[PDB]
Amino acid sequence: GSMALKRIHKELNDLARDPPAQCSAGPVGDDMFHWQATIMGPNDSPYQGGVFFLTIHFPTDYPFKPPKVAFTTRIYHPNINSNGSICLDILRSQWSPALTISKVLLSICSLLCDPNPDDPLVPEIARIYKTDREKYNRIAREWTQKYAM
């Protein structure tokens, strides 16, 4: 290569040794820059059970720019839009080359477990979430039923 290349090869090669808890990812074709992750809906979120698939796309000048990550799977979460885009700090402003694809998946997981108050990507969902979890989680698990599993 490289350099993103020789880097991403380690990334991948490490994600094999020590995969992040809930999921796995990898190259789709021989194009090492186009990845697909599968994330296994985390227990004690309202997404447990269902399985979710995400698309990873490394920029040519990764790790200095953050990778493009977005759910292909349908999902009910205030920080994920109807088109798949994720609303996460590291994915945008807070990204650092120091942090790995492995590490981002994790934070996505934890984001599914704990959505946000200031960030609402979909204001439709956020409001229901704010002080009516009861309702929120029903629709959350309902979608998990319908589209995830």
Binding site: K6, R7, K10, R17, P63, F64
Partner: protein
């Protein structure tokens, strides 16, 4: 500390550059004082990748 391998995988991993993650770390940041990247990765960075403290210089390390 658990037997056969590691630290070793881990020990080297603590000592390898944090961005190319290939070359061994060689550069202390000014002023943040992190010894966390190799000579080559440095120029492409404005802020130290660890604490988002902005880099203003480098000291090179000679483990001779």
């Amino acid at each position: 500390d658990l037997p056969v391998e590691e630290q070793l995988r881990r020990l080297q991993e603590e000592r390898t550059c944090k961005v190319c993650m290939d070359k061994e770390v060689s550069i202390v940041f000014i002023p943040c004082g992190h010894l966390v990247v190799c000579k080559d990765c440095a120029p492409s960075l404005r802020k130290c990748p660890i604490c988002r403290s902005t880099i203003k210089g480098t000291v090179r390390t000679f483990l001779s």
